[PDB]
């Protein structure tokens, strides 16, 4: 069949430009003579319709987005790609490339939507630290384990225990805002007691808008 | 200036028959063809009928729609209500060459009991304090229901000056989950002998404590 | 009081809304009293009309 | 009250707890089968719309 991609950095500052491009696999853009649109949702929010466009360069925007969107085609990549131009806080929305069937028809197929945040002020990438179990920390025969992500900006920010290995017990909490602008969270991992000086831990915290890819060892606390 | 006037909130119990609305404003709604998407939480929106009458290879048959163009609404039929169908509903239009969407529907679940409020904390770590910061860690798991107040002390002292604290969450098992989070000056943890935080959860109280080793 | 109303010609409560009978009706119809099995004490009300 | 047999008078109260006759079968005094409730129960939540 024919499958969408969507590319491009899942972040933009305000009154800047955007660029996110769709890619086409397994089929061809200028055959069949069908169109492409994109098609944007804010969370929690109805689905908003951006504009369309075709392969040639017919193209057609919302009113209420006239005069900010820019799309083209090029078919020697075999893809397009939306410009966005004076960019606000409010344009917070998870973008869904879907592939049009008709006009005034159906998106018969819906590319996965890729998150967009748009916040003021500079990129602050996070700051992990490990969380030691110790006595204290178990109640029972098992015991818990995580690491604290804190002073980042701005959301999201995913954590992974050994690589996405261990799933069972992992809480990956909402972040909260803090005193000072930046956000806060933690991911944890419950574990039985018996594996806490056997088994090594180490949580995967990964913030694609500051591209910092932090890897910290979890270990049991030690006394000086 | 057209809009598709979709009720916000719909709720159903499984087996029944319900039905959603599309009001449109200006324009009637037997112009151009609606589309209804059904919209999973976190995935892309899939297609569940086409030309207000006919079912795409792959919905089921209970995915039916009416247009009742007199009143210039919008019907989509639901028969037989079941736990996969809790997704969000957008009818869609074309309006002159501007496509416009639907406000968006929700189908509620209409359960869990109360769950022991296990509570874990956590020291600051070592690599911490040399960057000059500390933070004290609450962790509040596996509890029903979904409101625990949490209250920082300090030897015997309160504490709320930096207490930050997240809003419970609905668990993979159906229970809650909740964290706070403790801002502090290195020179504040070991001023004090040793910090404790308590959670209150229905009356009952577990605390933990921690101090500087 | 209803087995006289088995026949054809007639309008009725049971034969024309259960059963109806066509004039082309060559059936033969038997009909007994077996009261002391299909009836009980207290009301026996399984079946329905 | 979701069920009733018949219209009712203006400024009238009705308390009746009685099984509608809602297929009129004898279901041993309870909703099953051709039996159903009048009186049923809300969907109050304060986080609706």
């Known amino acids: 069949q024919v499958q969408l991609q969507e590319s491009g950095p899942g972040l933009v500052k305000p009154s800047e430009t955007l660029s996110l491009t769709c890619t086409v696999s397994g089929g061809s853009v200028s055959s069949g003579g069908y169109f492409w649109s994109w098609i944007r949702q804010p969370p929690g929010k109805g689905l908003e319709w951006i504009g369309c466009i075709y392969y040639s360069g017919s193209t057609n925007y919302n009113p209420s987005l006239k005069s900010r969107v820019t799309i083209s085609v090029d078919t020697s990549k075999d893809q397009f790609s939306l410009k966005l131009s004076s960019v606000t806080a409010a344009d917070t929305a998870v973008y869904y490339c879907?592939?049009?069937?008709?006009?005034?028809?159906?998106?018969?197929?819906w590319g996965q939507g890729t998150l967009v945040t748009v916040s003021s002020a500079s990129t602050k990438g996070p700051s992990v630290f490990p969380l030691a179990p110790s006595s204290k920390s178990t109640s029972g025969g098992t015991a818990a384990l995580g690491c604290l992500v804190k002073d980042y900006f701005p959301e999201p920010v995913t954590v992974s225990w050994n690589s996405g290995a261990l799933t069972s017990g992992v809480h990956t909490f909402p972040a909260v805002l803090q005193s000072s602008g930046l956000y806060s969270l933690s991911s944890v991992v419950t574990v039985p007691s018996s594996s806490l000086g056997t088994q090594t831990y180490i949580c995967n915290v990964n913030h694609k808008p500051s591209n910092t890819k932090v890897d910290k060892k979890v270990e049991p606390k030690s006394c000086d | 200036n057209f809009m598709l006037t979709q009720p916000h909130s719909v709720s159903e119990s499984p087996g029944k028959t319900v039905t959603i609305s599309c009001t449109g404003s200006?324009?009637?709604?037997?112009?151009?063809?609606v589309q209804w998407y059904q919209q999973r939480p976190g995935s892309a929106p899939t297609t569940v009928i086409y030309?207000?009458?006919?079912?795409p290879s792959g919905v089921p048959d209970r995915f039916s729609g009416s247009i009742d163009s007199s009143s210039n609404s919008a019907s989509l039929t639901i028969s037989g209500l079941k736990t996969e169908d809790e997704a969000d509903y957008y009818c869609?239009?074309?309006?002159?060459?501007?496509?416009?969407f639907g406000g968006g529907t929700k189908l509620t679940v209409l359960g869990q009991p109360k769950a022991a409020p296990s509570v874990t904390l956590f020291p600051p770590s070592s690599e911490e304090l040399q960057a000059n910061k500390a933070t004290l860690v609450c962790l509040i798991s596996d509890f029903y229901p979904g409101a625990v107040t949490v209250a920082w002390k300090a030897d015997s002292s309160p504490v709320k000056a930096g207490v930050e604290t997240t809003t419970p969450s609905k668990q993979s098992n159906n229970k809650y989950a909740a964290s706070s989070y403790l801002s502090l000056t290195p020179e504040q943890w070991k001023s004090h002998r040793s910090y404790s935080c308590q959670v209150t959860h229905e009356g009952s109280t577990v605390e933990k404590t921690v101090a500087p080793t | 009081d209803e087995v006289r109303q088995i026949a054809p010609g007639q309008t009725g409560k049971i034969a024309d809304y259960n059963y109806k009978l066509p004039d082309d009706f060559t059936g033969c119809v038997i009909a007994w009293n077996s009261n002391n099995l299909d009836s009980k004490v207290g009301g026996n009300y399984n079946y329905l009309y | 009250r979701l069920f009733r047999k018949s219209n009712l008078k203006p400024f009238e109260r009705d308390i009746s707890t009685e099984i509608y006759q809602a297929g009129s079968t004898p279901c041993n005094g309870v909703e099953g089968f051709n039996c159903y409730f009048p009186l049923q129960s809300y969907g109050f939540q304060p986080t609706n719309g």
């Open positions: 200006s324009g009637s709604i037997a112009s151009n063809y």
């Open positions: 869609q239009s074309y309006d002159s060459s501007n496509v416009v």
């Open positions: 030309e207000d009458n006919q079912r």
């Open positions: 879907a592939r049009q069937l008709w006009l005034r028809g159906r998106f018969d197929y």
